Design a protein around this nucleic acid. Structure first.
Ligand SMILES: [Mg+2]
Ligand SMILES: [Mg+2]
Ligand SMILES: [Mg+2]
Length: 660
DNA sequence: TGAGGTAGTAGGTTGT
RNA sequence: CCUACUACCUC
């Protein structure tokens, strides 16, 4: 199993803190008028920033790595109107212990402030936050592309600086939203006001006069009175958007699509060079790239009717559990009837599978109106389970409407763009897999022994002020989804998690004849304090064992091999109850960083299962998703519900995956 | 709307 | 940490 290797990650070990840095200067803060119980953290922190030097926040005070005699121990900070005045008092020096978690926390704070305060005063270039840009990758007429490392410098257990490096580019332009438009470039989709820092969604140009424009004063007079039209020359009008709003000599463009990924090996090179450079110029010593041992993991045994290397091959071999089913066709283009090949391809797959299938054809059209909805009612009534939609590229709005309409009839839909050709294999072969998943068929499954019988993933909606908390089970070592719950933010209500979970327990109970022994709980991103409290409590009582795991996409940094190829499916244990995974294999892989939040399973065992769940995804076809099937499924569910409403999911079978 | 990835651009979860 | 969108590559 454990085909052990050794690969170092994009971190670096540097000189151990000196005695002085272990004894930071302590200061006291006297801000009058006294802040509100609620207005402290953001204020008390902007006071340190104001105080100058490498100083951070120290609980109810400040802590510095700079002699008080070079700080601004008096001044006045302003936050949200009120102008409170501050006053620092030098109050000794307390020794800090890196061995302690709580103490080390502030030292690492100072260390980041150090890195920022010392990088800013280099003859180099910009320093946008944690970022740094040495050279220039390109300098076209109107745009400039500078390249950089994004950095972080913290303190370890032993008390030595740790410097994490990761190369990154930046697209910055000089020309105005007018000189750039006159230079001969199409209208951007994003603009940022040059008096402020707020941005807009540039909709069009205004066929109106600046001076004679009626504002809610005079348009050209507004920006004039505010002294914004000095040293410049406002051009023509422009309808920005949040309902339009007048605004082009004052606006600036946000370049993105207009006007290259770093090669895998050519990235680790620039990573070390930037390190040698940041330690040499900052007097932090010779960077010792931190290496770690990895483990090649067991290959997944994905199996249709017969074992298979990828879900797409399940089309010529057969499905894992194909039941009798009938699909439908909806052409929003000209012609009628299934294309010859899409039919041959389906009958073969269902031939192999052994189940019988009947292709239908909807002789209706959306434009008919309600006549159209009954065309569906009749289709469903005749036994149709899912419908393939051949239509030229639709608009987002028209797309959701049609999707939502069919769902209101209990018919998931897989869209496929009419400009189609037989030799576009991957295209329509995936279209079929996606249709079939939506129909309720289990394309492939996993052969093997896994610690948990049930695997559920939780995520959170998007868009509008509110989100949708949602989860989706995976019965036995078939997949299904549950009815989501609209919530205020990203934290999922404690009893909402439980109820969502309970549904998957009971789903499993329906499939097997018994409650699960053990469940694998996968939360997308960080797991807000105690959002799984009520959940894990219950599982305990009900005598079913568990494992919670933060699956984080960002923050896994990089991981390069000491020498040779980078193997697919590396298990890279890090600290305690936390490890990496490079679950996939053009650019440079971004490893997932998992964190065992509760349970007693060996990390090696979790990593194994998690990695295997990767290949369980139905509409994947010729490539597997980066995270586990359940977590990836919860993502899309949550996404589509938030996209086109929860109101439609009412009459939709939970075993049908409409969101894929 | 074939799907997966990584790579940009914004804006901003939770709990400092 | 996450929520989106856009562009390139790949089967
Ligand atoms: Mg999330
Ligand atoms: Mg997500
Ligand atoms: Mg799909």
């Amino acid at each position: 199993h454990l085909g052990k290797t050794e690969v170092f990650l994009n971190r670096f070990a540097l000189r151990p803190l000196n005695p002085e840095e272990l004894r930071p200067w302590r200061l006291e803060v006297v801000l009058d008028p006294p802040p509100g119980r609620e207005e402290v953290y953001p204020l008390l922190a902007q006071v340190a920033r104001r105080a100058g030097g490498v100083t951070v926040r120290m609980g109810d005070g400040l802590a510095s790595w700079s002699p008080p005699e070079v700080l601004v121990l008096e001044g006045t900070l302003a936050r949200m109107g009120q102008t409170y005045a501050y006053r620092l008092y030098p109050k000794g020096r307390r020794p800090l212990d890196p061995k302690d978690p709580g103490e080390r926390s502030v030292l690492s704070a100072l260390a980041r402030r150090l890195l920022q305060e010392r990088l800013r005063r280099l003859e180099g270039v910009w320093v946008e936050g944690l970022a740094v840009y040495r050279r220039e990758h390109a300098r076209g007429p109107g745009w400039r592309v500078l390249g950089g490392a994004v950095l972080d410098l913290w303190v370890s257990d032993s008390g030595a600086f740790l410097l994490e490096v990761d190369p990154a580019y930046r697209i910055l332009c000089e020309m105005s939203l007018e000189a750039w438009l006159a230079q001969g470039h199409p209208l951007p989709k994003r603009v940022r006001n040059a008096y402020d820092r707020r941005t807009w969604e540039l909709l069009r140009l205004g066929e109106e006069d600046p001076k004679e424009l009626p504002l809610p004063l005079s348009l050209l007079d507004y920006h004039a009175s505010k002294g914004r039209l000095q040293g410049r020359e406002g051009g023509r009008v422009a309808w920005v958007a949040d309902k339009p709003i007048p605004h082009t000599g004052l606006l600036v463009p946000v370049l993105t699509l207009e006007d290259l990924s770093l090669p895998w090996e050519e990235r680790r090179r620039r990573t070390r060079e930037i390190a040698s450079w940041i330690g040499r110029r900052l007097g932090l010593g010779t960077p010792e790239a931190v290496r770690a041992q990895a483990y090649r993991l067991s290959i997944p045994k994905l199996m249709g009717r017969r074992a298979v290397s990828k879900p797409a091959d399940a089309l010529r071999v057969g499905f894992y559990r194909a039941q009798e089913t009938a699909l439908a066709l909806l052409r929003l283009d000209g012609a009628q009837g299934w294309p010859e090949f899409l039919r041959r391809a389906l009958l073969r797959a269902f031939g192999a599978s052994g189940a019988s299938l009947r292709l239908h054809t909807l002789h209706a059209h959306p434009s008919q109106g309600l006549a159209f909805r009954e065309a569906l009612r009749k289709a469903k009534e005749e036994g149709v389970q899912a419908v393939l939609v051949l239509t030229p590229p639709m608009a987002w709005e028209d797309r959701n409407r049609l999707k939502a309409l069919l769902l209101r009839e209990g018919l998931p839909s897989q869209i496929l763009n009419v400009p189609l050709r037989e030799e576009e294999r991957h295209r329509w072969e995936n279209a079929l897999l996606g249709l079939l998943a939506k129909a309720g068929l289990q394309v492939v499954a996993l052969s093997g022994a896994y610690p948990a019988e049930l695997a559920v993933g939780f995520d959170a909606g998007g868009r509008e002020s509110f989100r949708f908390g949602g989860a989706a089970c995976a019965v036995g070592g078939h997949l299904l989804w549950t009815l989501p719950e609209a919530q205020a933010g990203e934290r999922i209500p404690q009893e909402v998690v439980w109820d969502l979970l309970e549904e998957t327990l009971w789903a499993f109970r329906r499939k097997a004849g018994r409650l699960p022994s053990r469940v694998l709980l996968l939360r997308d991103g960080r797991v807000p304090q105690d959002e799984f409290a009520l959940a894990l409590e219950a599982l305990a009582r009900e005598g079913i064992a568990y494992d919670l795991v933060s699956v984080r996409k960002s923050g896994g940094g990089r991981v390069y091999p000491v020498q040779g190829r980078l193997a697919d499916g590396l298990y890279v244990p890090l600290e305690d109850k936390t490890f990496l995974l490079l679950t996939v294999h053009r650019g440079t892989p971004r490893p997932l960083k998992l964190v065992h939040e509760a349970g007693d399973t060996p990390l090696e065992a979790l990593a194994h299962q998690i990695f295997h769940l990767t290949r369980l995804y139905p509409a994947s076809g010729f490539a597997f998703p980066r995270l586990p099937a359940p977590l990836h499924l919860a993502d899309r569910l949550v996404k589509e519900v938030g996209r086109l409403g929860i109101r439609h999911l009412k009459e939709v079978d939970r075993e049908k995956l409409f969101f894929v």
